[PDB]
Amino acid sequence: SGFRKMAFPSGKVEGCMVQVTCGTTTLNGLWLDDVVYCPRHVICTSEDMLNPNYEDLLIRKSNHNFLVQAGNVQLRVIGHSMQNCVLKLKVDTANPKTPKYKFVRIQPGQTFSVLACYNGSPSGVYQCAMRPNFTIKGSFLNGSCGSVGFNIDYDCVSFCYMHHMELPTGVHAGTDLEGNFYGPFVDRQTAQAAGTDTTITVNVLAWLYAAVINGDRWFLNRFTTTLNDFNLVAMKYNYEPLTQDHVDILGPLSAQTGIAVLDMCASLKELLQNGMNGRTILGSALLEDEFTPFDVVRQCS
Amino acid sequence: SGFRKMAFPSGKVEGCMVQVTCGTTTLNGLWLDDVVYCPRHVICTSEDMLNPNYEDLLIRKSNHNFLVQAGNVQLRVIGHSMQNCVLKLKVDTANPKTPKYKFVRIQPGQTFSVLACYNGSPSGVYQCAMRPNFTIKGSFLNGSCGSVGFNIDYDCVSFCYMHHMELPTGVHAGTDLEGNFYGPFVDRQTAQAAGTDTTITVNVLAWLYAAVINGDRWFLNRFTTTLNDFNLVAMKYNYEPLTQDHVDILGPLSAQTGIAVLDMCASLKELLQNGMNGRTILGSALLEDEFTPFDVVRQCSGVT
Numbered sequence: 001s002g003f004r005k006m007a008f009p010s011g012k013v014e015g016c017m018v019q020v021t022c023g024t025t026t027l028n029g030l031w032l033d034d035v036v037y038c039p040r041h042v043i044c045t046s047e048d049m050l051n052p053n054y055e056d057l058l059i060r061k062s063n064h065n066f067l068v069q070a071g072n073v074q075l076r077v078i079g080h081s082m083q084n085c086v087l088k089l090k091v092d093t094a095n096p097k098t099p100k101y102k103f104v105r106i107q108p109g110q111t112f113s114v115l116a117c118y119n120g121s122p123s124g125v126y127q128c129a130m131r132p133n134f135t136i137k138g139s140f141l142n143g144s145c146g147s148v149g150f151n152i153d154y155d156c157v158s159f160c161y162m163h164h165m166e167l168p169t170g171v172h173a174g175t176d177l178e179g180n181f182y183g184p185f186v187d188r189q190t191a192q193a194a195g196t197d198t199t200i201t202v203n204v205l206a207w208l209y210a211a212v213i214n215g216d217r218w219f220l221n222r223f224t225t226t227l228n229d230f231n232l233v234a235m236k237y238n239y240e241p242l243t244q245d246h247v248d249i250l251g252p253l254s255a256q257t258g259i260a261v262l263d264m265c266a267s268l269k270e271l272l273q274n275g276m277n278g279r280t281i282l283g284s285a286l287l288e289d290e291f292t293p294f295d296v297v298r299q300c301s
Numbered sequence: 302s303g304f305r306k307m308a309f310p311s312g313k314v315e316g317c318m319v320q321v322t323c324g325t326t327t328l329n330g331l332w333l334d335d336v337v338y339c340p341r342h343v344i345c346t347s348e349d350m351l352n353p354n355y356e357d358l359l360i361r362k363s364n365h366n367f368l369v370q371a372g373n374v375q376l377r378v379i380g381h382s383m384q385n386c387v388l389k390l391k392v393d394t395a396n397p398k399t400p401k402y403k404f405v406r407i408q409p410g411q412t413f414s415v416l417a418c419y420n421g422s423p424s425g426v427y428q429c430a431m432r433p434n435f436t437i438k439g440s441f442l443n444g445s446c447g448s449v450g451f452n453i454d455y456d457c458v459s460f461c462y463m464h465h466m467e468l469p470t471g472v473h474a475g476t477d478l479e480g481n482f483y484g485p486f487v488d489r490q491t492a493q494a495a496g497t498d499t500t501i502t503v504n505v506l507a508w509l510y511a512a513v514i515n516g517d518r519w520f521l522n523r524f525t526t527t528l529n530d531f532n533l534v535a536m537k538y539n540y541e542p543l544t545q546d547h548v549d550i551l552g553p554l555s556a557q558t559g560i561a562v563l564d565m566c567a568s569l570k571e572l573l574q575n576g577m578n579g580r581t582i583l584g585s586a587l588l589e590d591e592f593t594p595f596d597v598v599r600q601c602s603g604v605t
C-alpha cells in the first residue's frame with residue numbers, strides 16, 4: 001500500500017549522459033551506440049538566438065569544434081548531422097553502457113521520468129507528464145538542456161523527451177529524440193507562450209480508481225452520467241474532454257474495483273462541484289492528473 | 302525554474318540489488334563488497350513470524366539454503382550471521398559495482414531516496430521523509446522487503462534505510478543497515494501501529510522559501526514573530542517545535558530571499574490560523590513537509 005509519484009530507476013540513462021561543448025556553450029548529450037544526441041542550439045551564440053539559421057551556423061563547424069566528454073574521457077567526434085532540432089554527433093567509441101532502447105513520440109497525458117543533468121552529470125530524477133498544451137512542468141535550471149525523459153517498461157528504455165527551453169510562465173518545452181518539438185514551439189528566443197493548460201481527465205479518473213484500490217470510497221455517489229453530459233460539465237472546469245478511447249482504457253481498473261467508468265465520472269463531477277470539504281484522497285487536497293491508467297496498474301495491486 | 306519532488310539518481314544502488322531466496326520466501330538484498338544484507342525475517346514462515354526465535358531458526362540453515370541471484374548469476378553463500386534485525390550473507394565474490402558507501406542512521410525530518418525492488422529487480426525510485434513517528438509514507442507491495450533508502454553526498458552513497466514491514470494504516474517501517482529499527486517496531490506478526498504523527502516545521506519553512514524563489518509570494522506579510530510565540534502556535538497545530546538550530550540551518554535561504562526565518566514564521570502562523578483561502582503554493586493546497594533545507598538549496602542551485 002501507499003501511493004507515490006514514482007520514477008523509473010535512472011541507472012540505464014545515467015550511463016548515457018555526456019557533456020557537449022561548442023565554443024562557450026556547454027550542455028548535455030545522450031550517448032547511444034556511437035551517436036551523441038543533443039539540442040542543436042548548442043551551436044548558437046548570444047546574437048544568434050532570435051533568428052538563428054542553423055544550416056548556416058552548422059556548415060561553418062568542423063567535427064573538432066565539438067568537445068564531447070564522457071566522465072573523464074574525451075570522445076572523438078568523427079561526423080555530424082542535424083535532424084530537425086537535434087544534432088547527431090558521430091563519435092569514435094560505441095557507448096559500452098548502451099541499454100536496449102527505442103525512441104517514441106508521446107501524446108499529451110503520457111507520463112515519463114526526467115533525469116535532470118548539468119555538465120553531463122545527473123542531478124536528480126522525477127516524474128513528469130506531457131501537458132495538454134504540450135509543455136511539461138519540470139524542474140530545470142540553466143545548463144539542463146539536453147536532459148532526457150524516458151520510460152522503462154521492461155528492460156528497454158523508451159526515450160521520449162529532450163529538454164530545450166523554458167517558457168516565460170516557468171514551464172518547459174522540448175523535442176522527441178528525432179528532434180521534432182512537442183507543440184507549436186520553436187528553438188528561437190522570439191516571444192512564444194504556452195496555451196491555457198487543462199486538466200488531464202483520464203488521469204484524474206485513473207487516480208480515483210487508485211484511491212478505491214487502496215481502500216478509499218468516501219467520494220463515490222449513487223449517480224451515473226452520460227459521456228456527453230460529463231464532458232459538458234468538465235469543460236466548465238478546464239478539464240480535457242474524455243473520449244471513448246479513454247473510457248475503453250479505464251476498462252481494467254473498472255473491472256478491478258467494480259465501479260463503472262461513467263459512475264466514476266459522476267463522482268468526479270461531484271468533486272468538482274463540492275471540493276473535498278477538508279478531506280484528502282491519497283494524501284492530496286487537489287485532484288492529481290499526472291498518473292496514467294497504465295501507471296496506476298503498475299504501482300497498485 | 303520549477304520545483305519537483307526529486308530523488309537522487311539510483312544507478313549506483315541499482316548495481317547492488319540482488320534476489321535472496323530462503324525456502325519459499327523471496328525478497329531483496331543489498332550486495333556490497335562480499336556481503337549481502339537483507340531482513341532477517343527472510344528465514345521465517347508465516348507461523349514462525351507469529352513469534353520468531355531468530356537465533357534458533359538460523360542455526361538450522363546451511364549456506365546452501367540461501368539462494369542469491371545477481372541478475373542471472375547465482376552467487377555462492379559461504380557464511381551467514383545476524384546483526385540486530387539484518388542478516389549478513391557472506392558470498393564468494395566481491396560486487397565489482399560496489400560504490401563508495403557508508404551506513405548512516407538518519408533523524409526524523411531527514412529525507413532520502415527509496416529504490417523500490419521486487420525479485421532483486423529495481424522497479425521505481427521516489428523520495429521519502431522519516432516521519433516524526435519513525436514511519437515512512439512509501440509505496441510498497443509484497444516482495445519489496447529489503448528495498449533500500451539512501452542519499453548521495455558526493456560520489457559516496459549513504460545507505461540509511463532497509464524496508465521490513467507495512468503497518469495497518471498503510472505506512473512503512475524498517476531499519477538502518479546495521480539492523481536497528483526506526484521507531485518502536487519489531488519484526489514479528491503481532492499488533493503494531495503508527496503513533497500520531499506531527500508536521501516537520503523546518504521543512505515546511507524550507508518549502509515556503511522554495512515557493513518564494515520560484516515566484517509564489519502571496520503568503521508573505523509585514524509581520525515577524527519570536528521563537529517562543531511561534532512554538533506556542535506550532536504545538537496547537539501538531540507541528541514540531543522549531544529550535545534555534547533550525548533557524549540557523551535556514552539562514553542561507555533567509556539571506557537570499559530577504560525574508561528572515563521569523564518573518565517566514567509569521568507567514569506560516571497565518572496560514573495555519575486562516576488556511577490558504579482558495580490559493581495554492583507550488584501547486585499544492587496542503588503545506589508540504591518532505592523537503593529539507595538542504596533539498597531546497599540543492600534543487601534551487603543545481604548540484605550533481
Ligand SMILES: O=C(Cc1cccnc1)N(Cc1cccs1)C1Cc2ccccc2C1
Nearest residue numbers: 041044140141142164165166186187188189
Ligand atoms: O530556455 C533556455 C534554457 C533553459 C533555462 C532554464 C531551464 N531550462 C532551459 N534558453 C532559451 C531558448 C532555448 C531555445 C529556444 S529559446 C537557452 C539560453 C541559451 C544560452 C546560450 C545558448 C543557447 C541558449 C538557449
Ligand SMILES: O=C(Cc1cccnc1)N(Cc1cccs1)C1Cc2ccccc2C1
Nearest residue numbers: 345346347441442443465466467488489490
Ligand atoms: O509487512 C510485511 C511485508 C510487506 C508487505 C507489504 C509492503 N511492505 C512490506 N510482512 C509482515 C511483517 C514483517 C515484519 C514484521 S510483520 C511480511 C509477511 C510475511 C509472511 C511470511 C513470512 C514473512 C513475512 C513478512
